[PDB]
Paper text:
We have investigated the function and structure of Trichodesmium Tery_3377, an iron stress-induced protein (iron deficiency-induced A, IdiA) commonly used as an in situ marker of iron stress. Using heterologous expression in the model cyanobacteria Synechocystis PCC6803, we provide evidence that Tery_3377, a commonly used iron-limitation biomarker, is localized to the periplasm with a suggested FutA2 function as an iron-binding protein of an ABC transporter. The overall fold of Tery_3377 assumes a classic small molecule ABC transporter substrate-binding domain fold, with two domains hinged over a substrate-binding cleft. The hinge region is formed by two short β-strands and connects the protein domains via a double cross-over between the N (residues 34–133 and 266–349) and C termini (134–265). This type of structure places Tery_3377 among class IV iron-binding proteins (in keeping with Ref. 27) and allows for structural classification within cluster D of the substrate-binding domains.
To try and crystalline ligand-free Tery_3377 to examine structural changes upon iron binding, we citrate-treated Tery_3377 protein preparations prior to crystallization; citrate is known to chelate iron and was added to remove all iron from the protein preparation. Additional support for the plasticity in the binding of Tery_3377 comes from the observation of bound citrate in the binding cleft, clearly indicating the potential for binding of organic compounds. It is interesting to speculate that binding of organic ligands together with iron may represent a mechanism of siderophore recognition. The structural data further show a remarkable plasticity of the substrate-binding cleft, allowing organic molecules and potentially siderophores to bind in addition to Fe3+.
Author numbering: 4 to 319
Amino acid sequence: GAINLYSSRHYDTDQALYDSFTKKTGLKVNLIEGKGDKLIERIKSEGANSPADVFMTVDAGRLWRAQEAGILQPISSSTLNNKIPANLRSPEKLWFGFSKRARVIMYNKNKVQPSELSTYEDLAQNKWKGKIVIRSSSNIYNQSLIASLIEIHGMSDAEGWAKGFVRNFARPPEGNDTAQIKAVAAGIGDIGLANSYYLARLKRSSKPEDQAVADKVGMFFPNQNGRGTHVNISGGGVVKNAPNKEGAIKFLEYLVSPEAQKIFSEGNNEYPVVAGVPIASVLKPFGSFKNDSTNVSVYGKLNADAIKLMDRVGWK
Ligand SMILES: [Cl-]
């Protein structure tokens, strides 16, 4: 038989994972690609007629939106629950993380030493005036990080932080996460926020200009002396009306195997979720880091609050 995998998270190296799955289970993987938000809308519009078995995307904020659209069904699996850390899966078992990213401080190594960095909260301090670059508030990764800060601090204390943070922008938000790393390399900012895997992607590039940017920029995992670094997921779930629910479950279970964890995580320079699986060579030089134990569903729950806060403080 077969499963229909609707994914915004596919890389071509994942074909090896699909082929291994098929060898192990007999199930073919039919891949349907699209942007994550577009795939949610697609599955919603397909309704009860949808062939989708598995939905995969990035960011718990987006997985939460999927869940609230009613397109997922809950799955109880010993294998998923044992192998996936509780903080990286939906409390309601609607979706599950399969690789992990961190939203980190990217810094210009010539201008900034790691001893100068500490927490997310410290980024609102006046010493950083004119020195921070970050992308738009319309980006989900930012929404999820600010949601986490609202959960910790409450709206009033988080708004105080955000006002200071925005005050420190070197320029109006412009470009994607990679653009922020480039701006840090070029001296437009001294620090920026971006996901871990974008630095690794530059490190691995064959383009000399990308390598030169990676040579100039370090990454710092914040809040190590306190709650830990903000982590988020690439993840997925079984679709509400899946025509092959058993096969869908088998696929999710296969993704937590050590083989699949390596292939899937390394395909986008992300970290495994499963304990004991070795980390990608490109990530090792940055070291291990304490992860916050907050359940990542919170970042979806508070997504609208994050958007509102960012609007209120003038984060463009
Ligand atoms: Cl929590």
